[PDB]
Every structure is written in structure tokens, then in C-alpha cells.
Amino acid sequence: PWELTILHTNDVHSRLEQTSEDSSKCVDASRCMGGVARLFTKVQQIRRAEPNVLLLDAGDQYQGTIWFTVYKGAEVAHFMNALRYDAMALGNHEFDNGVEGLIEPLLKEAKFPILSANISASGPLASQISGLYLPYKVLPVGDEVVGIVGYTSKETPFLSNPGTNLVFEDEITALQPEVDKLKTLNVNKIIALGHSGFEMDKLIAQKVRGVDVVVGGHSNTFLYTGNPPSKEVPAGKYPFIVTSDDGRKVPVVQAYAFGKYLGYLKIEFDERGNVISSHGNPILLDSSIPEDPSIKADINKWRIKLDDYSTQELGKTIVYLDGSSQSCRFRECNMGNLICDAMINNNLRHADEMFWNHVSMCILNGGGIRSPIDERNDGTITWENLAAVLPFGGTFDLVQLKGSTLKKAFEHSVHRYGQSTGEFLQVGGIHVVYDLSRKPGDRVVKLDVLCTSCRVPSYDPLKMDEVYKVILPNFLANGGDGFQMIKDELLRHDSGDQDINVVSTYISKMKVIYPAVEGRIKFS
Amino acid sequence: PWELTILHTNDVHSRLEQTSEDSSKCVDASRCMGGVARLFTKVQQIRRAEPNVLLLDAGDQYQGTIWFTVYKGAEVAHFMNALRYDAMALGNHEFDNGVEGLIEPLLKEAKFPILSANISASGPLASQISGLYLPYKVLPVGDEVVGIVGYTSKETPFLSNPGTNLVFEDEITALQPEVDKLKTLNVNKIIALGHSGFEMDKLIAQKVRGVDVVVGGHSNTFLYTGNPPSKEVPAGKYPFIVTSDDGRKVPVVQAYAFGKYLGYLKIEFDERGNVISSHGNPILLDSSIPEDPSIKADINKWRIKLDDYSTQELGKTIVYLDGSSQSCRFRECNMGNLICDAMINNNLRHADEMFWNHVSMCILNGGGIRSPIDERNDGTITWENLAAVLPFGGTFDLVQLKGSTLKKAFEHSVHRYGQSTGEFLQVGGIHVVYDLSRKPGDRVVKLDVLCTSCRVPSYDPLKMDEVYKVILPNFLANGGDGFQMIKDELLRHDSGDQDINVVSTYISKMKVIYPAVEGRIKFS
Ligand SMILES: [Ca+2]
Ligand SMILES: [Ca+2]
Ligand SMILES: [Zn+2]
Ligand SMILES: [Zn+2]
Ligand SMILES: [Zn+2]
Ligand SMILES: [Zn+2]
């Protein structure tokens, strides 16, 4: 039997530096986790021990910290090249800076193949991008070869900025003919590496004949066999076994997000390329693994421009930005309005005749707003200032919620009003009126929402049975501040851009901001 | 006696081409008026006949048409140089593109002195601008000399974009020592040429000892002796005689605006430079005066780039821009919200600790909105498109109104609701609620306005006795659409930027717009 060790990362999301256990900024260095220097140490160790190793990334290196804001993917090429990745699939966030922001910094500088079989280009872009990403690559491993076939979320147009010159095809449709073609080229060991989420990964393992292993991402899925080593709760065993339509057992793996774990799967293959066995587990990259000194010194050299950037003027405010708790946990606050307006601006996606924009609505817990910004520094706003407002290292995510769920959230928002609790909601594209004299759970007396399926945006009453797209902090999507109803009832969730970066980009675009308190939230 | 002919213009406001009688676009060429080609013919005729002539401009050549949008003052230098102006005073609108937009295109290219005695600079700007404008110039006229001493509105910081490196001093304070100095230099014939408005011009004639003549502007004041030749109604005789503190009669002149008239004043001086007599009248530049063929051909050559510019993309809308009458004469319309938001953005002026901005409020009659803009041309918006929405050639002016006056305006807005009349008001920084079941004059049931004297903008009830700054179309300032109360009760009025240009600049700055109907106007 021929044994392959697959090492894999996904959804690293700009966590170049080691992080806290929750993937936010490292504060107590002695307990920090992840980062590329630590990953380098672990990968190097494994490569000393195991003859046949592949190191794969399932996409979404782009977007997540000030590293991506400043270096715009140059950091991803540089540090993935330094760790000698063997292949990467394109993720949705690889399109955040458009096609031009993918071609240059990443496709032109990577020393490893970048893969997606279900993305096609037309017109002059097709010539410009031809060959810079591939449907698959056949890689030599020892005296054998392994085919790696890539895929990217069909939903990428709603979740990034790929432009109107790329088409994202159904994954299974696109993959099958490529996997069949590899068989004709005497390639009997095939890995599907891609970025569509655990549910689609299971469908690909079931339906794409010839796929031996699926290495996925997007959904930040944690899988583990045994007692978990940290706070993440497994969604299933590692690997997750799918029974294929052809009767085979096909392992499906993912490794959470944020570079906290290195996925590690050992596969035994027979001579015909059938999987005989699979076993492994993600490895927690904790402080018991030393950061590689050479990688750490280069990280520290690259950090200098980040530190300089953090104190530069992004734009100006002519108004006090009221992020005080006394305001934002009790009533509409202009900092809340600013952040929700930035959230909706970040989620403007491709023009379509059925909606002016796919999403119009935003909620933001007042407990997520942790500082005001004074306008009396010549109006200046810096990244440092925004990091005090939004200190938790989160994302502004896209969810689908029934109106009933959103009514429950707004009831929760005021269920114990008056104690300066974090659940009070700031909003955009929503007009709410409370009557605090009513019983808890029955305090929402008006709730109107901005249409999407309309050429002129206007407010209509919320419909309990209708599904709404909402932009909200990942903390709330995950049921933080008691919003268990959002976690338990949401119909779709896709992780969005870094919180600070969403606001910084909006401020830079607007140049001079002056958010008002305007009646989005009223009391009767 | 030594006789001087003073020819003067003021507040030409980018009317390079001949115009309709109301200073809008020329449609029936055979009845059009003004324009620089026609002015050239008249000035040339007078200079053939009169030995001692000065041609003076009292400021505000900048701002008013697509000529200024495209050429940014290069057109003013070129065509004022072609008409051989002898001197110009700086107006407030000469600061619309900041100091840099005055230095280059106008101060560096004019072949005549540009004057203001009451503007001082500090820091490195003082070195950069030194000598490029002057407090006064002594000009040879025949065998005599005439001193021309300039001045500019003290209010210019509120009415343009001069920046924080220029100080506008009290006019009379600044002028007196310069006029005294000219006396010491044996200059006994002194013209004060400046841009502060008729009321200040009368104070300068009264109080500045040694001033022989005041040539003013800013207030678009029409003065005439006898039957007026067109539709403008005189504010007084031409010249307006002020009795000075020293006992002299001092003529004050102005010549309306828009290049429709050439001011013409004949002065007789004795040997000591005392005015013995003054008489004249503005000359209507109507179609009985031919356009100079050479100037007209150069105007037609320069028009080519204007025509090309008019169809270029300014920005994009992802929403239908609903400027239909069926919407904007009956209810809040998103085109109205867009235009009022552009009006407030245009009037963001220098940061101060007593207000986030000096003005927060906007009204716009629905009768002034004359087209929608469809978003289905790839979202494109062009200047041509905006000219269909705003076809009348107006300005968005700054006024001061008691709250009582504004309540009367909002009552007027709905006094005969339901007939698709033009008086219905679109708004910004104002939230109004009507109850149409109430009697006409008593239909406004809530009227809240955005604070200015506040660090966080928020809405408070309108106060009947408080004075509010409001941005509104000059049509309304002049009592159009039945708003006689605005005309009769306003406390201050300053003419603002070209309507189309205000919206085009906002669209360009924003790049992608998506104005909503959001509850600024409600019915109960
Ligand atoms: Ca196989
Ligand atoms: Ca004199
Ligand atoms: Zn991701
Ligand atoms: Zn993803
Ligand atoms: Zn003017
Ligand atoms: Zn003026």
C-alpha cells in the first residue's frame, strides 16, 4: 500500500501572526496559537518524518486582518511560498479586490498551482487570465502522481467582488468531466480541493465518481475524532465518511479557520488508487510548538508597515462619533448608524434587474461597539481609532433570517431594557418602534424593513414568513449576547469581511462623514 | 473737468454664452441676451467713442454653468483677457475650488490686476500667493491715474471653500488705510471695486473717506434711472447716491448678474479728484447688439469639450431615480432626497467647535424636479441626464428663515394637496408629518429639524422664533411656486452653486448612489 499524508489549511483569513485562542489579537504570547511561523515548524517536522506529503489550502487566505488591508495578498503569496504549499483552491474572499486583485499579488507570484475547475471567463479577461488558475494539477509525489481538482463556491458573486466577466458553474457539473479526464491520463489518485462549504463537500464526495478525498473549507467546519483539544465543538468525526454513489467510502475533511489547526489525514491507497484506509485529526497549533525563528523574524519585519499604516488618516468626521455604552446600549447612536451603513456598503454586489441590491438590512449589538471617536483631532480617523471601537477581531456576515426570527431578535434587544446590556440593536435598513410599557416579548410595536426586490428602496412592514438577508456580526450569528434564536433559526450563513476593514473602507470612500441620529429606533 | 466712463460687470457666473431673458439656456437665438461675444461688441463700440474708459469686474465670474465645471476658470482668464478688463475684484465664488483653484487658472493667467484689500494669508500660503492679488492698483487713464481698491465679502468662509489659511477682514477696517495711503501717493481719484453686496457697498460709500465711486456685486442688485428695459425691477436709481460722513455725494453702482447688462457710469472729476457729476445706466445686452464674430467663433471652438463632457459617465445609480411628478409632487421621492443630500454636501464648510456644520437643512419644490433617471443604462448618470432633471439654470442658495416662516412654507406645501402642483416640498435634515384631514394652513402636525449647534446631529422640534439656515433653489428664495412668505420674510440670502453642478459633484464623489424613500415626509 502507498501512504499519503495530506496536510491542509482553509479559511486562514489573514491570520499571519499568532492569535488568541478565539483567533483575535494575541495578548498573552505564552498562550497564543496559530500563525505562519508556528505552522512552518509543524509542517517542517512532519515533512522530516513522512515521505509522501502534500500541503494543501482550500481557499480564503485573503481578508481578515490589517495584513490583507496593507499587503493586499502579497503577504499570502510570500508566506505560502515560504511554507512551500503544494496547491491552493480559490475561495470566495480571493475575489474581494476583484479579479485584478487576485491576478496581481497572488496568481502571478504563487510558486504553487492555484485551482478552480468551475470558474470560466469571457471576453478579453479570458485571454488575460488563461492558465493563471487551472482546473486541476497532477503532482508528482515520490514515484507516484496525485491529481488535485479545485472548486469554488457557486455563491461567490453574492459573497465577494468577482465582477461580471467570470461565471461560477455548478461544482459537481464542472468537476465530473475533469475527474473523468484524469482517469484517461492514468491518474488514479484524485483529491478534490475546494471552497464551497461542508454540505457541498459531502455532495461532491457522494456524486463525483473517482474522487478519493475531499478537502474543503468556507464553512469553518471543525471535525475531530475523540476529545476536542480546545473550545471548538466538532460537527462530526475527522474524517467525515461519505458513502459514494459508486459504493466507495470517501473521506471529507476541513480544519476550522484562522490557522488555529493544521489538518492531518493519512490515506492508504492500493495499486489501483482505491482508498484502503483513512485516519487523522487536525493538530492544534498551540504554544507547545515553537514559532520558527526565521519566519517569525520576517513576520516582524513585515509588521513595521502595518504599525505605520495603523496611525495614518483614513478620512475625517465632522461629528462626534458616539460609540459610548450610555448611548449605544440604550438608543439609536450615530456610531451604530455609521457601522451599519458601512456594512451595507460593503455588501453592494453585481447589478441585477430583480433587486437594487441583494441585501438592504443590518443589525449590530451595542455591546459590540466599544469606544467613541472624538472629532476634535482635526477630524482625523485612524485604523487604531477603529480598532478601539471594534476590538474583537470579528466579521460582518451575511445571514438569511425569517421575519419571525428577526421579530424575536428585536424583542430580545429590549427584553430587560435599562441595565446597559449588550443585546440592544443598532440598525440599518430597519425602522423599529418599541413600547417599553408592554410585557417583555411584546415590546416591538412597529418593524419596517427596506425592500430589496424594488427599483426604488422604501420601507414596508416586516413579514413574519418572509426570509430576509441581514448583515450582522459573526458574534450574533453564533448566538452571542443571548441571540440564541439567530443561531438556531438562520437559514444561511456566509462569513464576511473583517469588521474594522469594512468601516475603514467606507470612511476612506466617503472622505468626510457626518452620521446623524435619524429615527431608525424610536420609543413610544 | 476730466470725464471717466466706468464699464462694469458683476456676478457673470459662467454665462460665457448668450442666454434666455431669464439667464437660462438660450433657446430662441434671435431673442437671446448677454454672453461675452455680445459684450465684446458693446465694449469695443464704447471704447471707439469715449477717450477715458475703465472696464471693471466686481467678482463672481466663477460658478454657474458647465463652462466652469469643465474649464475651472481657464475660460474666465481667456475671455476676460480677450475683452481687455482693466481690473477685477475677488468674489466669494472665486474660492469655490479652494485657493489652488484660484491661483491656477485665474491669478496666474489674468492679464489684469485682481484685487482684494481685506484678504490676508498666513504660513506657507502667504509666500505662495504674495503679489498674485493686490489690495489696489493705480492705473493710468489718459494723462491721469485712477486708484482701484478691492474688497471681498467677510462672509466668504460660509459661502465658498477658501480654506483655513485665509482671513477675511472687515471691509471698512481694511479699506480705509489703503485709501489713505493712495492719497499720500498723489492719487485723488479712487474707485472701490468689490464683492460684499449692495448693503455693504452703501456702508463703504458712507464711511470710507476718499472713496469717489463704489462698484459692487454679490447681491445681484439691479439699479436703473427711468423705465426698466426688461423684466428686472430696480432696487433704486442708477447710480444710488450715498451721502458720505465727509459730506460728499458718492455714487454706488451694480449691474444685476449673468452678463445680461453692462453697467455704464460717466463721472466728471475736478482737478482735485472730487466728483462733480455722475450719470448713466446699465445697458441691456439684447439681440439688437451683434455677437462679435471672432469671439463667437472661439466660444464655439471651446464648446466642443463641453458637449463631449455632457455625455460622460459622472457615476452610477443602482436604484431608479424617481423624479416623476406623480411621486415628487405627492410624497417623498428618492430623487428629491438625492438632490437635498447633494445640497447639504455642497454646503459643508470649515470645521468649528460651535457646530458640526453651519447648515443642516434643505427644501426643494417638487415642481423643480423635471425628470427621473433610469438606472438600466448600466447605472450610468451623465450631466445631460441631470440637465433634464434640473433644466432651469438655477442655483441652490443659502437663506436664513425664522421657524415661523418655515412652518408657513410647509403649510403652503400641502394647502391644495392633490392637484399635482409644484409647491410640494422635498426635504433634507427635516422630518415633517402632515394630516391632510385638517384645514389648509393647519395640516403640519410634526416638524423636526436636524441640529447644527451639536456634536452629534439629531432631530428636535422646530422652534417658531429660532432662525434656521436652509439651502433651497433660488426660484423659492425669489417666491416662486407661491412661496411669497420665503421672499418677504427671509433674513439673509446668498446665491449658491449651479443646481446641476451641485448634484454632479455629489454623484462623482459618491461613485455609486442608492437613495431610498425613508420617512422624511409622512402622512397621518
Ligand atoms: Ca482513485
Ligand atoms: Ca477723490
Ligand atoms: Zn472563509
Ligand atoms: Zn469562504
Ligand atoms: Zn454671485
Ligand atoms: Zn457673490
Distance of CA B293 to the CA centre of its chain: 29
- CB–CB of A205/A249 below 8 Å? no
Which of B338, B354, B514, B524 best tests the A interface by mutation, with the highest count of A CBs <10 A?
A: B514
Compute, in degrees rounded to 10, the torsion defined by CA atoms B345, B349, B351, B356: -50
Crossing angle (nearest 10°) for helices A293-309 and A74-82:
170
A217-246 CB burial, b ≥16 within 10 A, e <16: bbbbbbbbeeeeeeebebbbebbbebebee
Q: What are phi and psi of B316, to 5 degrees?
A: -125, 150
CA distances to A87, A253, A261, B118 from A256, in Å: 19, 10, 7, 68
- In one-letter notation, the amino acid at residue B278 is S
Measured between CB atoms, which of A334, A514, A515 is closest to B357? A514
> What phi and psi values does residue B103 have, to the nearest 5 degrees?
-55, -55
- Assess contact for B91 and B152: CB atoms under 8 A: yes
* Residue B162 to chain A, least CA–CA distance (Å): 17
- A318–B357 CB contact, under 8 Å: yes
What span, in angstroms and rounded, lies between the C-alpha atoms of A217 and B456?
43
What secondary structure letter does DSSP report for A342?
H
Optimal mutation site among B455, B505, B508, B524, interface A, most CBs of chain A within 10 A: B455
Question: B249 vs A425, B193, B211, B242, B275, CA distance in Å?
Answer: 70, 17, 10, 6, 8
Q: How many angstroms does the Cα of residue A493 sit away from the middle of ligand 3?
A: 11
Per residue in B158-186, is it b (16+ CB within 10 Å) or e — as a string? bbbbbeebbebbebbebbbebbeebeeee
Whole-Å CA distances, A299 to A101, A192, A287, A291, A294: 22, 31, 17, 11, 9
> What does the radius of gyration of chain A's CA atoms come to, in whole angstroms?
24
Count of CB atoms situated within 10 Å of the CB of B128 = 13
d(CA A157, CA A175) in angstroms, rounded, equals 19
Tell how many helices (H) and how many strands (E) occur in chain B: 16, 27
Distance CA B486, CA B471 (A): 12
The three-state (H, E, C) secondary structure of A393-434, written as one string: CCEEEEEEEEHHHHHHHHHHHCCCCCCCCCCCEEEECEEEEE
Pick the CATH number of A5-303 from 3.30.70.3460, 3.30.420.140, 3.60.21.10, 3.30.300.30: 3.60.21.10
Q: Other C-beta atoms within 10 Å of A417: how many?
A: 17
Q: SS3 for A99-113, per residue? A: CHHHHHHHHCCCCCC
For A457, which of B456, B511, B516 is closest by C-beta distance?
A: B516
Q: Which residues of B touch A515 (CB under 8 A)?
A: 457
Which cell numbers in the block locate residue B501?
A: 453642478
Measured distance CA(A190)–CA(A183) in Å, rounded: 9
Q: How far is A368 from chain B (nearest CA, A)?
A: 20
* Sign, CA torsion A462/A467/A468/A470: positive
B304-523, which class in CATH? alpha beta
Round to whole Å and give the CA distance between A163 and A123.
13
C-alpha cell recorded at residue A336: 451604530
**The amino acid at B165:** N
For chain B, the distance separating the N- and C-terminal CA atoms, rounded to the nearest angstrom, is 74
Cis geometry, peptide bond prior to residue B113 (ω within 30 degrees of 0):
no
- Our CA-based measurement puts residue A345 at a distance from the nearest CA of chain B, in whole angstroms, of 10
Report the amino acid identity of residue B158: F
Contact A121, A162 (CB under 8 A): no
Going by the annotation, the residues of the binding site of A are 11, 13, 60, 92, 195, 218, 329, 365, 370, 392, 475, 481
C-alpha B109/C-alpha B221 separation (Å) is: 29
Record: contact A351-B378, CB cut-off 8 A: yes
Q: How far is CA A31 from the centre of its chain?
A: 24
CA atoms lying within 13 Å on the CB side of residue A25: 11
Q: Cis (ω within 30 of 0) for the bond into B239?
A: yes
Nearest to A455 by CA among B322, B307, B231, B28: B322
Candidates B272, B269, B267; CA nearest to B241 is B267
Instruction: For helices A36-49 and A74-82, give the axis angle rounded to 10 degrees.
Output: 30
**B383-407 exposure pattern, b = at least 16 Cβ within 10 A, e = fewer:** bebbbebbebbbbbbbbbbbbebbb
**Cβ proximity of B59 and B91 under 8 Å:** yes
DSSP line for B433-470: EE-TTSPTT--EEEEEEE-SSSSS--EEE--TTSEEEE
Q: Is B125 exposed, middle or buried (0-12, 13-18, 19+ CB in 10 A)?
A: middle
Length of chain A: 524
Specify whether the CB–CB gap between A90 and A174 falls below 8 A.
no
What 8-state DSSP symbol labels residue A352? Answer: B
Going across the sheet that includes A136-141, the strands are A136-141, A144-152, A190-195, A213-215, A249-253, A240-243
Chain CA centroid to CA B420, Å: 31
Distance CA A176, CA B59 (A): 74
B459:A511 CB<8 A: no
Strands (E), A292-345: 313-317
Q: Where are the domains of chain B?
A: 5-303, 304-523
- Kindly give the residue spans of alpha helices, DSSP state H, lying in B20-163: 36-49, 66-71, 74-82, 100-102, 123-129, 156-159
Q: Which residues precede gaps in chain B, with C-N > 2.5 A?
A: none
